[PDB]
Amino acid sequence: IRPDFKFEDLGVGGLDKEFTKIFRAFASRIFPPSVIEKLGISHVKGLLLYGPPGTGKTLIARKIGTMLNAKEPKIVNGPEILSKYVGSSEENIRNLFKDAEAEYRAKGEESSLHIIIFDELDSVFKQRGSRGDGTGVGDNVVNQLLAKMDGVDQLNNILVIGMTNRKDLIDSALLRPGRFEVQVEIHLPDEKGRLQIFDIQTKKMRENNMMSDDVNLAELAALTKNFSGAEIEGLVKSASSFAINKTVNIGKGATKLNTKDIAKLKVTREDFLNALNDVTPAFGISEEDLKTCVEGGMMLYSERVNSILKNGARYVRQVRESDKSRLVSLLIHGPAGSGKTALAAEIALKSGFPFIRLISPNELSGMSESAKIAYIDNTFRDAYKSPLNILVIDSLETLVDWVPIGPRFSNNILQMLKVALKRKPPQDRRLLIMTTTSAYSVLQQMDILSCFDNEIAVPNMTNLDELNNVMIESNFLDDAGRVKVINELSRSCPNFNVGIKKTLTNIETARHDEDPVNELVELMTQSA
Amino acid sequence: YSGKQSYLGSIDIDISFRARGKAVSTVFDQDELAKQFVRCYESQIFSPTQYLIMEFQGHFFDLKIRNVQAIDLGDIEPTSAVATGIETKGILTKQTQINFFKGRDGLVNLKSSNSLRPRSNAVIRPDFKFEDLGVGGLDKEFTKIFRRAFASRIFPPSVIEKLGISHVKGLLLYGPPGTGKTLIARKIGTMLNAKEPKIVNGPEILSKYVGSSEENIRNLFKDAEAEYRAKGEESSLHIIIFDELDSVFKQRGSRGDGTGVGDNVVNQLLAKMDGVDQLNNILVIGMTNRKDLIDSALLRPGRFEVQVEIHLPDEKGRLQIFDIQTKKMRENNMMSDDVNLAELAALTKNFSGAEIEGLVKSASSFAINKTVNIGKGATKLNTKDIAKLKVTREDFLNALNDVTPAFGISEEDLKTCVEGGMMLYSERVNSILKNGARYVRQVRESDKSRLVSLLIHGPAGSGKTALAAEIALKSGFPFIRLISPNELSGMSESAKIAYIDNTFRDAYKSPLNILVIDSLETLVDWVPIGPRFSNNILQMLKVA
Amino acid sequence: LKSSNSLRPRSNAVIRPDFKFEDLGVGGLDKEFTKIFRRAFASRIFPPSVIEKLGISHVKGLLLYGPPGTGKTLIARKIGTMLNAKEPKIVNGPEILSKYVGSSEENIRNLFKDAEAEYRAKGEESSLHIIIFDELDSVFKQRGSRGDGTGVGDNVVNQLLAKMDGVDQLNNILVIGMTNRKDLIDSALLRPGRFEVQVEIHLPDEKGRLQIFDIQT
Amino acid sequence: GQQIFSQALLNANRRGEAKTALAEVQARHQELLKLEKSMAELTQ
Lengths: 528, 544, 217, 44
Ligand SMILES: Nc1ncnc2c1ncn2[C@@H]1O[C@H](COP(=O)(O)OP(=O)(O)OP(=O)(O)O)[C@@H](O)[C@H]1O
Ligand SMILES: Nc1ncnc2c1ncn2[C@@H]1O[C@H](COP(=O)(O)OP(=O)(O)OP(=O)(O)O)[C@@H](O)[C@H]1O
Ligand SMILES: Nc1ncnc2c1ncn2[C@@H]1O[C@H](COP(=O)(O)OP(=O)(O)OP(=O)(O)O)[C@@H](O)[C@H]1O
Ligand SMILES: Nc1ncnc2c1ncn2[C@@H]1O[C@H](COP(=O)(O)OP(=O)(O)OP(=O)(O)O)[C@@H](O)[C@H]1O
Ligand SMILES: Nc1ncnc2c1ncn2[C@@H]1O[C@H](COP(=O)(O)OP(=O)(O)O)[C@@H](O)[C@H]1O
What we know:
The PDB classes it as translocase. This is part of a larger assembly, with three copies of chain A and one copy of chain D. Chain A is an alpha/beta fold.
């Protein structure tokens, strides 16, 4: 290993722990040989790196040869080993080990370490315990490797590295002690690693004064919650495409270059926002879902909402603080259309826990029963990982398919939910589960009410003052208008019970059609 | 002789070296050469192909003026075409934009030195317009495609090398049949001053012998790498187009064949598009009708970055297509003056791009048949008949009866729903129709009310559905559809669920949509004896 | 020969205006004949000057469907063998498919190259080529509907799509197809540019029945 | 209910070890130019 080195000096960001673990591979070969035999420990021979597409593995494989002294690991891609002829492919594998074998047999243990790397290993090493009964070359090849790999005949200066996107395909016959011992999983970067990826990618950008000082990397890292490194340079280049396209007007006209402005080319923040608008990760969780639920927004029209929110704050604090409360469940009930889901979404978003998820009939749409069961189980299982987790269940009654004629419903989902709601998470995890419903009596009657620790009622609004508050917030009409309407409604129909959603709907309809009293008041009166 | 174009504006010179055993490795500065050329040889008349001996620091050269620009005094921009004809001449000035390119022998190590000038072989041909491609509609997609893809190749190399970036090397086009996704690839191949495309039809790569398929898929890149190792950056762009990608490159992991060939070609393409080595001068085009079967790994950035969707045209596009297709007729005076294209564009509601040409064909067929009368009255061909051929409007009207839309198959139900006619025997109908129109207005104008639902109920046999269709038809919206028991009859239950789900997913494309549901009760299998009814469908509708 | 200044018909004409519907011998079906000869063959009688002065390509597809035992094969054959063109390359239904990994698709590709080469060599004066598929509905099924653990139901359709209308043009071929059931043929084959004219062939009316009796005896 | 394909292995690898056929092909060329030179001398 070269002394002219430190780990900082290369572009791999975020993966530091993995570097330490893999190095912790080469430790055995640092010392003079004499120690190790006296310590009776063999060297590891097989390595596996694996992760989802676009994690950076190929960069590590390419760049590692610099650190690792002597000369060079040999490189091969999977499907070039196979060959036309009988026995040629068989030969090809058992041709690679020759150089190192020779040097070793000659020099004994002084042998320089040899590395060989199979990029894209899965191409050919499928399970030899397989069938299909075509020509058996696909078996013979793997046999060869194993013969040279296990019964190495004391060849103790070889390290094979396997690169893959999909571990499971590979033969179980390669995954045992003595042959590909350690398997290292490389997963999506954290926010810090995300910052370092910006750091390395925008390095050169930053030195030669091409980037406007307006840009501040931290907020960009904050926004991009879900991105691969690959995605990150994609974003960088999208931004640059925007920035460049302001001088050169493609298509329209000919190539009109302002040779002066070329010297003044500079990227800006808005370019980056557009670039964000273009790219979209396959990360897929897209938890922006929460915000679209609360897109109607919160106006705090009364004290009741305030009290409820403070109670939610009390519970989130409680679960965060105590260690003996590792599971808390709550119910939220009220009249239909009063507006319940939004409130839970508000509490959840304000919480700011690492992990949040929502379950709604919308995603459950269209599957068969068993698929729904599977999905529910999977999402729960997923929820159990991070230390602190918020999970919301929406409109249980719709999920369980209640229709009152039979009454008909699917029991199995109900049983799943009932069982799952009582299960404490694994050790040293805490969970907070928030369920909403609208038909309390049914919930009473089938008799699952015992699995909820505390319940919150949310009565709809009834007093004309609150109507005045919400409508001033909506800027429906001028001030005299907002006064006259309420004065008229005071005597038209003082007793009043609507909800909230319907009020917004009526406000908009009246705004379009006839914002005098003669429509809006009429619609509330019919509704009420 | 010239009259006005009396000066030499921009002169491109192939600077061969005189004697090739003398070949000087010291780097040659185009600025010094231009200054020397002006200083020594001033106010001389030069023509294209005039050869010249340049003694610069004892290092002779054989300049050939490959091209000359002739400009008149007073021209702010050099809009005059660079003329290769020997007739054009000029008078050299101190302002002449002298460009040197290496000679035919290529021996001269010329530099750009702050020369903010077009590349040696800027592919995209500096004066170029979308109107010359010949594709109507889709005036926005070209912006995206060229901006993201080719914007980076034209700009001078030093500053991009500063921008420390690699060009994109992938491009995908996907959509329903007949939208015009083959025309783009072809003209992009043919109009861009690059090497010839290396066409491969989709599943051309499979081969009998083992190990020959993968060979075939890595035999395509050989010239690109060959040029890249030698000439580095200044290699000309290579383009290879895969036609109809989705045949072979399936998601590896299925059980497709029972041999294990698809996985290998997938592996090879994956390893070669990005790989360990850098190519940085290659571009690939993809095309397909489904985006969902392509293996995931392909779509990661660095391979097939930009994906573009091609969808059916709107009315403006329809007018443009009629313009393009019926271009030559008009200038060849083979068309009556009575046809006005606007009404044609109005009539063809759901026509795709690929149907209009058939319409042209049929109209022509009617006109031409009018003369020949194949069969019975043969041999009437004569000069007089053919000497005044013109197509007529009624031929188009007749032609509408042969060609039929493919996507516009459900609105036909709507127009036939009111075959019984409509009568205004009562005031009530007018009030109802007006109210529906009012609601239509409200939805059209609004921005925040993105969903409205109505219900129409009354005694059986009261004539409900016809009124609903009457509301729907006058709206003029782009997208209309109808779901009725007649369609779902004979299907299996799961198929019903899938069909309804797909129809709702297909109603989220256009900005404005109208959807009609007929006789919910029969859709949900209501019979009062039990009563019995299928719950799952009921749920699906309720949630949706 | 040479085209004089007078616009006389093509030298090596295809249809020969000394032609009659009663020469075929197919009784009954009468209007359909009018349709097919109007839409498809009309373009190829006029002098190429004017037809190129319309800048329009000829139709390159024909489909016939109907109940069993109605006369489809008769039409196919008669059209096959009273025109001025090279001998048609008949193919039976599942005749393309082969054993080895890549012989089927090559078998699709074998069918067209002679027309391609002739078109390259000379151009617009090339003699017409005919190839007729019999009984389409055996192999060319809706892609991605059949599970097809044997993955042939995709690639054959894929080849024929790519090669009947691809990045390279070709406008001297006419392909004729026959079937009993179009409802299972892939949708992408029935758009303009591929199988333009579709014709139903039905059971005969009474007068047609009289015609058929006249023909047979 | 199953179908399979098959792939051939060309073999004939005795020939394939060398270019392909060089037994009485490349040697024939070798000695045939010699025939040409000797005949040139004979005609001279
Ligand atoms: N202070 C508020 N309290 C409740 N809802 C509010 C408030 N301010 C605005 N809203 C809006 O009122 C609506 C009420 O919530 P939502 O539409 O989910 O109703 P819901 O009663 O939960 O639904 P459902 O009737 O389908 O069971 C939402 O659009 C929400 O954004
Ligand atoms: N928007 C359009 N502009 C110009 N020509 C068009 C347009 N749409 C269709 N055409 C004409 O009709 C053809 C449309 O089909 P084309 O040959 O492009 O195949 P395609 O639509 O990609 O087919 P598929 O996806 O089914 O393989 C064009 O080649 C062109 O001749
Ligand atoms: N003024 C009218 N209003 C409605 N329908 C009319 C009128 N004049 C004639 N008709 C015809 O009468 C038909 C009545 O059938 P329609 O399906 O509309 O009635 P329906 O009560 O919905 O039917 P069903 O009995 O099947 O439930 C209409 O389809 C239309 O063609
Ligand atoms: N319209 C017709 N005029 C004259 N003869 C006819 C007609 N229709 C059928 N025939 C006679 O019927 C015989 C069989 O016809 P043909 O083979 O075309 O049937 P087909 O429609 O191809 O049937 P299938 O769908 O079973 O393949 C022919 O040999 C012909 O003599
Ligand atoms: N620090 C980094 N972390 C992650 N990815 C990076 C980093 N720097 C660059 N990359 C990009 O990650 C990509 C690695 O792709 P890779 O995951 O090897 O593809 P595959 O998974 O198909 O082998 C490259 O495009 C590389 O430019």
